[PDB]
């Protein structure tokens, strides 16, 4: 036993090496353009590694946190990387409108950090305006 | 905050949205009906949804119509707001089991609505009303469900308890019929030496499933077959000694334990044989076999084997007929040679043997359905061109 006690990443950005190295990382992030995509609807008939080698022909996943709930219950979600936005476009055009069992394997970009609730807010507003309008017209 | 967007589950294909509109039109605020004809072949997912402009009329249509027969099948109308979260959470339909085989979601819903509005209620109510005596009942959330657990675990309901403590698999009305004290799948141990007695079948075996009944199986021939029936406590310990005591030593000899007279509660033995047949059923050839259709009737396995004798090691020559009478075209020769089969792709495809040509393709019942898909494609295509023709033909 050479008991190698690992250290988690606590050292961050003291020398110039993380400053210029994260400048190169930001230069990479200027050139990824939605590589690591949020996998939505990990379906029942599609497993984690089943997904990871269905899309291994269609991207290089440098960071693969594709799991289920410790493979107990489903996550329903993961992360699968792609090549380029036009390879993302062909991945859109090839794997589309296929029900596996009940939910489509919709691997795409990440959004909705509010905007689901902004939509739900403006839809409630629209329903209120249209509901007074239709109540007024029905009350004639 | 949706007004109403409501689950309608355990459907049947007769119920269209016209019939749902005829049901829910005197409720008062009909917004829309999302019939979940899933996009494989317009099939239901087991359910659909109805959307209402009114939240109160939606709550009305739930609490009036929950397992009521819409066109003869009871309507499993519940909430499904957290149900895509139950989908991409794994949670949802919990196993409130040992339910009643004569009580549906409506009567037990109105019974245990004092325990809560059951947001995911199902019993085993298939077969137009028949429950098998269990199901996946789950309430609002963990608190109401845990209230039902800690309040009612083992109470009486028409002479039957419930079991949500363990995730109890199917056949629960007939659970005690499985647990009856006479029948049990024994364990045939093959090739036993005569040293093993009724005492010896209980010594190292009662730990792996308790034994009172230990029978040194002599046959109707006086001797031993070498096969002795080990009578454990449960068919899971039949599992434990078919896949743990396999060729084991009781004293010094083999325990080839097979399942003496399986009672079907553990299953799927040799179903992989099925998938072994999937090496050669619809993906028929493995570049070896030859589905040679459209022989002559005088071309039996006689003349098929006669033609394919230069085409490698013939292993299976076989023509299915009208009960060994009239073949309606097709035979098969499973080869042992793939390159002679390629030589037949050259030669014995587009081949007169007697007077009528051979027809060669890999043999599947799989993509008959895909061919029907292509028939749907060409049908909608000719419908489209006829629609354009009748439109612009004026």
């Amino acid at each position: 036993k050479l008991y190698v006690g690992r250290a988690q990443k606590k050292n961050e950005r003291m020398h110039v090496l993380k400053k210029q190295y994260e400048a190169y990382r930001l230069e990479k992030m200027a050139k990824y353009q939605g590589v690591n995509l949020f996998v939505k609807n990990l379906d029942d008939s599609v497993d984690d590694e089943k997904l990871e080698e269905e899309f291994a022909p269609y991207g290089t996943i440098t960071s693969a946190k594709v799991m289920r709930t410790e493979n107990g219950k489903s996550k329903g979600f993961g992360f699968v990387c792609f090549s380029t936005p036009e390879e993302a476009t062909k991945a859109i055009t090839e794997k589309n409108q296929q029900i596996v069992a009940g939910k489509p394997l919709y691997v795409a970009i990440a959004q909705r950090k509010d905007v689901r609730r902004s939509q739900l807010a403006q839809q409630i507003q629209a329903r209120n305006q249209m509901r007074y309008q239709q109540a007024t017209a029905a009350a004639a | 905050n949706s007004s109403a967007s409501l689950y309608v589950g355990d459907l049947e294909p007769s119920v269209s949205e016209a019939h749902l509109y005829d049901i829910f039109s005197p409720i008062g605020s009909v917004s829309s009906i999302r019939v979940c004809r899933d996009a494989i072949t317009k099939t239901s997912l087991g359910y659909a949804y109805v959307n209402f402009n009114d939240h109160e009329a939606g709550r009305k249509a739930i609490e009036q119509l929950n397992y009521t027969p819409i066109k003869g099948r009871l309507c499993r109308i519940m909430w499904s707001q957290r149900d895509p979260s139950l989908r991409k959470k794994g949670s949802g339909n919990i196993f409130i089991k040992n339910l009643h085989p004569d009580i549906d979601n409506k009567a037990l819903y109105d019974t245990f609505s004092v325990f809560g509005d059951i947001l995911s209620s199902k019993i085993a109510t298939d077969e137009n009303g028949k429950s098998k005596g269990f199901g996946f009942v789950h309430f609002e959330e963990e608190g109401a469900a845990k209230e039902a657990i800690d309040a009612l675990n083992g109470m009486l309901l028409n002479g039957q308890e419930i079991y949500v403590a363990p995730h109890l698999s199917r056949k629960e009305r007939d659970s005690q019929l499985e647990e009856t004290k006479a029948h049990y799948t024994n364990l045939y141990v093959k090739n036993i030496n005569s040293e093993t007695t009724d005492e010896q079948f209980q010594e190292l075996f009662a730990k792996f499933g308790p034994i009172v009944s230990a029978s040194l199986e002599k046959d109707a021939d006086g001797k031993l077959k070498g096969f002795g029936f080990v009578n454990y406590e449960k068919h899971e310990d039949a599992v434990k000694a078919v896949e743990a005591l396999n060729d084991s030593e009781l004293n010094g000899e083999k325990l080839y334990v097979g399942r003496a007279q399986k009672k079907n509660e553990r299953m799927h033995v040799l179903k992989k044989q099925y998938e072994a047949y999937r090496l050669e059923k619809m993906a028929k050839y493995q570049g070896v076999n030859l589905f040679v259709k459209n022989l002559d009737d005088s071309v039996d396995d006689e003349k098929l084997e006669e033609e394919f004798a230069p085409y490698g090691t013939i292993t299976s020559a076989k023509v299915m007929r009208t009960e060994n009478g009239k073949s309606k075209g097709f035979g098969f020769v499973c080869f042992s040679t793939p390159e002679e089969a390629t030589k037949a792709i050259t030669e014995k495809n587009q081949q007169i043997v007697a007077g009528k040509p051979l027809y060669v393709a890999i043999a599947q019942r799989k993509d008959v359905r895909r061919s029907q898909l292509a028939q749907q494609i060409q049908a909608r295509n000719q419908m489209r061109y006829q629609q354009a023709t009748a439109a612009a033909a004026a």
Binding site: L26, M29, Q119, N128, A137 | -
Partner: protein, 447 residues
């Protein structure tokens, strides 16, 4: 007529600010070029709020009230539920003027027009920020019957502060900034009612205080006939009661807006000095302000001085904030104006550029003047970099657009297109050249 958004990062998308987290003062951006997204979407929401109608009738409500047509209701969160509401948007004959019209039906003991006339002129002579125009009051035979109509301006984003902080979707509270801002707005309007010699009116406490403007507004619409629709020193004493009520209310609602929990209002018999001394994230000087705003015991109609006899610095910091908002508003308005000028400029640019018969040679020049026109076009638009790859830099372009938009006498060297025929040229000459070319082609009387 259909319900959709067209703002799902669709009018103009969002941009990753992680590059802006590590960015240089030379490094500019398109929002730094044009506008941040928030003001844009707020103004477009205001525009659609002005024109929340797609061409229909709406004849089920009465639709024309004495040259005020298109009666359309303010249904933001309208507190007249299960009832035909009274507060509408309407369009006048003059200005098409966007008006809140409020019609009060079913009156009998208010038949004198003199009472509403003196309440009219007595409150038409008033003039303040939060003192929305009190107009156009008469009883009519429509909106049911005997509807006393009054008119305020339309003023969108009905944000009675419970809307602005608790119905509010991102849930932001109001810290000490908007505290003192609303303090000086209320101090303004109580100075206004001590000036114009009227009461507190009727409404406060998340009622009629809809925030139309951006930087923190009161905009208190209703200070009107509470009971006399059909002393004054006591009313200008109970102004402190209403006011210290709202101040205790929001001064403890900061502790509830710590989380995302909708509060309840905490009326006069909850004003307790232990809660004054024990609430958190409050200035203790402001706690002593509320100790004075423990309501008016000595019933003189007390002016705003004894209120403001604790402080004047934070009023200046509010004034500071208002000047800051106006200044960078003028900054981004200067950016928008120069964009409009340069867009008209490039409209003039490509107006004559690219004739079909001109595109013959390598450079696409037909006649005498056209090559000294399109001389510019390579180093203005087609700017390959120093490394050699053809790219676009919006800030070299805009500095060029600045230097050319005036048409100054300063020259510039160019190489076009053979890198032998060099040139230098001054920019007034370019301006006059484009003008003469524009009259040479779009003469606009014959050509």
């Amino acid at each position: 007529p259909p319900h959709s958004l067209l703002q799902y990062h669709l009018y103009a998308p969002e941009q990753p600010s992680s590059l802006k987290s590590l960015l240089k003062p030379n490094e500019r951006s398109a929002d730094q070029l044009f506008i941040p997204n928030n003001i844009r979407e707020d103004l477009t929401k205001k525009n659609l709020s002005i024109l929340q109608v797609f061409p229909s009738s709406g004849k089920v409500i009465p639709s024309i009230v004495q040259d005020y047509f298109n009666l359309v209701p303010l249904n933001f969160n309208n507190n007249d539920f299960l009832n035909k509401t009274t507060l509408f948007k309407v369009f006048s004959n003059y200005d098409g003027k966007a008006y809140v019209l409020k019609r009060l039906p079913n009156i009998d003991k208010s038949m004198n027009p003199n009472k509403i006339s003196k309440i009219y002129q007595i409150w038409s002579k008033i003039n303040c920020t939060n003192l929305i125009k009190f107009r156009d009051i008469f009883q009519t035979t429509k909106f049911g019957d005997l509807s006393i109509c009054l008119v305020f301006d339309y003023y969108p984003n009905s944000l009675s502060l419970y809307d602005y902080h608790f119905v509010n979707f991102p849930k932001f509270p109001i810290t000490n900034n908007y505290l003192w801002i609303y303090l000086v707005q209320l101090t303004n309007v109580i100075n206004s009612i001590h000036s114009q010699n009227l009461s507190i009116g009727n409404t406060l406490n998340w009622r009629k205080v809809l925030i139309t403007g951006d930087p923190g507004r009161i905009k208190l619409s209703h200070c009107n006939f509470m009971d006399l629709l059909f002393t004054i020193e006591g009313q200008q004493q109970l102004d402190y009661k209403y006011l210290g009520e709202l101040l205790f209310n929001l001064s403890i609602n900061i502790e509830n807006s710590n989380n995302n929990t909708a509060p309840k209002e905490y009326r006069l018999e909850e004003i307790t000095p232990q809660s004054i001394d024990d609430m958190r994230q409050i200035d203790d000087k402001f706690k002593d302000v509320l100790k004075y705003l423990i309501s008016d015991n000595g019933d003189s109609k007390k002016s705003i001085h004894d209120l403001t006899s604790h402080f004047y610095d934070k009023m200046f910091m509010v004034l500071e904030s208002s000047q800051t908002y106006t200044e960078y508003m003028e900054s981004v308005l200067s950016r928008e104006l120069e964009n409009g000028r340069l867009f008209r400029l490039v409209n003039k640019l490509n107006c004559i550029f690219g004739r079909i018969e001109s595109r013959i040679d390598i450079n696409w020049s037909e006649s005498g003047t056209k090559f000294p026109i399109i001389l510019f076009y390579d180093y203005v638009f087609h700017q390959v970099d120093s490394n050699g790859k053809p790219i676009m830099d919006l800030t070299h372009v805009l500095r060029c657009l600045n230097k050319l938009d005036a048409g100054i006498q300063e020259k510039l060297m160019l190489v076009t297109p053979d890198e032998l025929n060099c040139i230098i040229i001054s920019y007034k000459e370019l301006k006059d050249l484009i003008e003469s070319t524009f009259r040479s082609i779009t003469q606009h009387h014959h050509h």
